[PDB]
Design a protein around this motif. Sequence first.
Motif, PDB file in Angstrom:
ATOM      1  N   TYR A  64      31.849  46.089  30.407  1.00 42.79           N
ATOM      2  CA  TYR A  64      32.324  44.791  30.913  1.00 42.79           C
ATOM      3  C   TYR A  64      31.685  44.568  32.267  1.00 42.79           C
ATOM      4  CZ  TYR A  64      36.049  43.989  27.524  1.00 42.79           C
ATOM      5  OH  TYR A  64      36.760  43.786  26.391  1.00 42.79           O
TER       6      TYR A  64
ATOM      7  N   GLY B  80      32.379  41.693  33.896  1.00 47.83           N
ATOM      8  CA  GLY B  80      33.513  41.048  34.587  1.00 47.83           C
ATOM      9  C   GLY B  80      33.122  39.984  35.614  1.00 47.83           C
TER      10      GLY B  80
ATOM     11  N   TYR C  78      32.734  39.983  38.819  1.00 53.09           N
ATOM     12  CA  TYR C  78      31.814  40.429  39.907  1.00 53.09           C
ATOM     13  C   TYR C  78      30.415  40.789  39.424  1.00 53.09           C
ATOM     14  CZ  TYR C  78      36.154  40.215  42.479  1.00 53.09           C
ATOM     15  OH  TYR C  78      37.272  39.730  43.034  1.00 53.09           O
TER      16      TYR C  78
ATOM     17  N   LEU D 104      41.775  46.361  36.062  1.00 48.63           N
ATOM     18  CA  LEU D 104      40.366  46.621  35.653  1.00 48.63           C
ATOM     19  C   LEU D 104      39.503  45.364  35.931  1.00 48.63           C
ATOM     20  CD1 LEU D 104      38.892  48.909  34.128  1.00 48.63           C
ATOM     21  CD2 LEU D 104      41.349  49.203  34.789  1.00 48.63           C
ATOM     22  N   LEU D 105      38.384  45.578  36.610  1.00 52.33           N
ATOM     23  CA  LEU D 105      37.438  44.462  37.042  1.00 52.33           C
ATOM     24  C   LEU D 105      36.130  44.575  36.255  1.00 52.33           C
ATOM     25  CD1 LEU D 105      37.837  44.654  40.908  1.00 52.33           C
ATOM     26  CD2 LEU D 105      39.288  43.403  39.205  1.00 52.33           C
ATOM     27  N   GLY D 106      35.656  45.779  35.958  1.00 54.34           N
ATOM     28  CA  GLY D 106      34.453  45.990  35.143  1.00 54.34           C
ATOM     29  C   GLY D 106      34.289  47.438  34.739  1.00 54.34           C
ATOM     30  N   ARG D 107      33.364  47.686  33.850  1.00 52.91           N
ATOM     31  CA  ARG D 107      33.090  49.026  33.311  1.00 52.91           C
ATOM     32  C   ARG D 107      31.663  49.189  32.837  1.00 52.91           C
ATOM     33  NH1 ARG D 107      36.353  48.824  29.253  1.00 52.91           N
ATOM     34  NH2 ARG D 107      38.226  49.621  30.302  1.00 52.91           N
TER      35      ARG D 107
END
Lengths: 191, 190, 191, 193
Positions: C8, C10, C12, C167-170
């Motif tokens: 992700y 996301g 940002y 959670l914002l990204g991965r």
Amino acid sequence: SVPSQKTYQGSYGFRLGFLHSGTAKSVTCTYSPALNKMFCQLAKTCPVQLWVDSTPPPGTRVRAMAIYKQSQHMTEVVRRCPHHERCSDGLAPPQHLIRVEGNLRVEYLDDRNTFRHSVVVPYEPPEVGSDCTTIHYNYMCNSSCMGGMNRRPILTIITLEDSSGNLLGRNSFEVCVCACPGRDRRTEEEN
Amino acid sequence: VPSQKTYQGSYGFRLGFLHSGTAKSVTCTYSPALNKMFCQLAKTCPVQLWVDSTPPPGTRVRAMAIYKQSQHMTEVVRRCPHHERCSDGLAPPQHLIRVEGNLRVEYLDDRNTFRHSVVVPYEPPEVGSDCTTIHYNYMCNSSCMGGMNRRPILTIITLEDSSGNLLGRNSFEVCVCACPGRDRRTEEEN
Amino acid sequence: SVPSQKTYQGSYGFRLGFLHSGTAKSVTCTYSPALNKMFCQLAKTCPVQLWVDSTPPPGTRVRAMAIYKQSQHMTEVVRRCPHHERDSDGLAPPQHLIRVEGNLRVEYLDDRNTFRHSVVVPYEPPEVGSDCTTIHYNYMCNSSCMGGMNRRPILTIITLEDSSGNLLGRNSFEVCVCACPGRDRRTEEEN
Amino acid sequence: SSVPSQKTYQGSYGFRLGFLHSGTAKSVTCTYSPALNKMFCQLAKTCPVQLWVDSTPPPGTRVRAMAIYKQSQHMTEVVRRCPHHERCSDGLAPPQHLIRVEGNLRVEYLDDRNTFRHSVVVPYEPPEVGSDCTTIHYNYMCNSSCMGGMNRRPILTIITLEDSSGNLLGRNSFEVCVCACPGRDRRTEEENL
Ligand SMILES: *C[C@@H]1C(=O)C2CCN1CC2
Ligand SMILES: *C[C@H]1C(=O)C2CCN1CC2
Ligand SMILES: *C[C@H]1C(=O)C2CCN1CC2
Ligand SMILES: *C[C@H]1C(=O)C2CCN1CC2
Ligand SMILES: *C[C@H]1C(=O)C2CCN1CC2
Ligand SMILES: *C[C@H]1C(=O)C2CCN1CC2
Ligand SMILES: *C[C@H]1C(=O)C2CCN1CC2
Ligand SMILES: [Zn+2]
Ligand SMILES: [Zn+2]
Ligand SMILES: [Zn+2]
Ligand SMILES: [Zn+2]
């Protein structure tokens, strides 16, 4: 203040071309090489050819803008008259004189600082076996329109620009939008 | 589900959008082709109101987001848990859509549908101009995890009288993204 | 519930970058873009870059966790071999495979429910001159350590989360911890 | 000096470069000038460079390409893509790198940690059954004219043959012009003489 009309062939050898249409009564659009002047009818197809010596890269755009020819009127934005600007508009702002027909990727701009109108399309190269790219412009008022161009001659400025907007090429031609382009061309040439 | 049916009504109510183009630096740009506004998180997103005749005093203008896709349409559009965190002024922290530069703004959590909306008084055009402009802000990105999560939304704009009766309606799709100019130019390449 | 490894970017625009370090004998850590795989030495510096299109707020945190790649090992907690657990810096638990070096605000978790190990640090924006944020990870066991990973492949999962855990990204990458990272990258690519 | 070595050396394998005899027709996307030792090519198009050897290098041999500025006042400046072209990527190449290799999945890119110079490396493969030279397909990812890039400064590409342990075996070089019309630009440059 006033956008530049100075011809600039630039790095890609940018030139304009126009059909050799003649001056018969049937003609809806005819270019005078003697005058560097297009004569076209209201809202009808005006083909403009882009000729280049080298192929500019994808993301290149082609922009058109009209300005008043006479120095006294040059800072006035060229726009449609109140009659014609009343909202067939499709993707085009009702105030804009210049449209492109037959291009889904057409983009129209009102300059937030200059308030000038322009129309933009992506540059596509010629088909294989073709020497030039054709854009079909439409002019959406008559040069005679009361409260718009009001008989004042205009120039169309065609700029080639990169994907960031920087100038790559500039050409121009005078335009008369009139009922009888063949006749008007032949008469304006006879002086 | 809220009605999304275009309705010019008695005052000839239409939406307009600036002709901003797709320069890399643009903050907000509408695609006539896609009927779709591309804008940046928390930045001005001008929407124009055009009328053929002047709505009566006490007319209001409401905005509400719904998800475009059938299978997400009953789900209330709201900020992601990350963005919902307090920090907001006159706006509820969960609301996606704000209005800026209007001290008479009102925000609603529908006690029955739980939908969010934002309302202002209709004011006629200022001296010289032919339209009324409302500055909306979208307070999540379309790509926010745990919010819209790359799902497309529509904004529904409604003109209502003082008693909440429908006078007009229109709508547009929204993308909230880092670079509206690029994203419009790219989406139009199909 | 085996932890998610789904990419992700996301809000940002979160992605990972690695140095273009090459495969010379002297290299201590090298990433293969074709394999999405980092080759590094036991306990040596493994720079992992965070790239964002937009700056997340101060308070944003960056978590790393290892999981076995193969479906039949996925539910087993990745931890150091018996030898290596028995060295410590005084902040890291002795069972954790992944440490962060050169960060006084490092935090380590043993999940109360899953028992999985992770290591967290505060997100800081890029330094001046840089377009990305670098975290120095250390892997404290060899891929070949019998009684730990025992040549089972692993993924490292990098998660960007806010101060509240949201959670914002991965993103993720495969890891091999070995004696000769340059030689092993060159050999694995050669299929 | 600080600048890395450009001196030609055929070394032990008798290493030299070859180039197709492509002529200067308008359709040609790359063309080499033997008179100028200069390759004219188009942005991001195939640029075949032949490796000629007298004896076959061991498996594990590597072929590296690097760009340097030709003019002494610029030689210490790292050659990189302009900021515009850096923003436009095959997922294997670093976006800043001028020189890519096309069609070679074993390609390796280096950012030198102390010189900050860029280079691209592939494994040396011997000629196929029914060929006499190995061909690498380079792509140059920025125009010679690009402002904030080469900005009309001439460059050399340096091609090194090196063993599996990084030991230099041979070195050759050629000047490069990345331009819209290689055929036309080769003819014009050859007619000043
Ligand atoms: C779209 C671009 C970017 O990526 C940042 C923010 C807005 N523009 C200019 C810089
Ligand atoms: C079309 C015609 C007009 O109406 C005036 C301006 C341009 N052209 C000459 C006179
Ligand atoms: C006529 C007017 C409208 O009502 C909308 C369409 C075109 N123009 C601007 C917005
Ligand atoms: C964050 C929280 C508060 O503390 C008040 C303002 C907004 N939200 C509801 C009440
Ligand atoms: C902005 C962009 C997205 O991220 C999805 C919703 C709207 N638009 C298309 C897909
Ligand atoms: C590092 C190396 C090993 O030891 C096995 C797991 C991952 N990689 C390939 C096989
Ligand atoms: C391609 C051309 C240029 O633009 C300068 C460098 C190399 N060549 C001569 C001048
Ligand atoms: Zn008119
Ligand atoms: Zn959000
Ligand atoms: Zn171990
Ligand atoms: Zn460039």
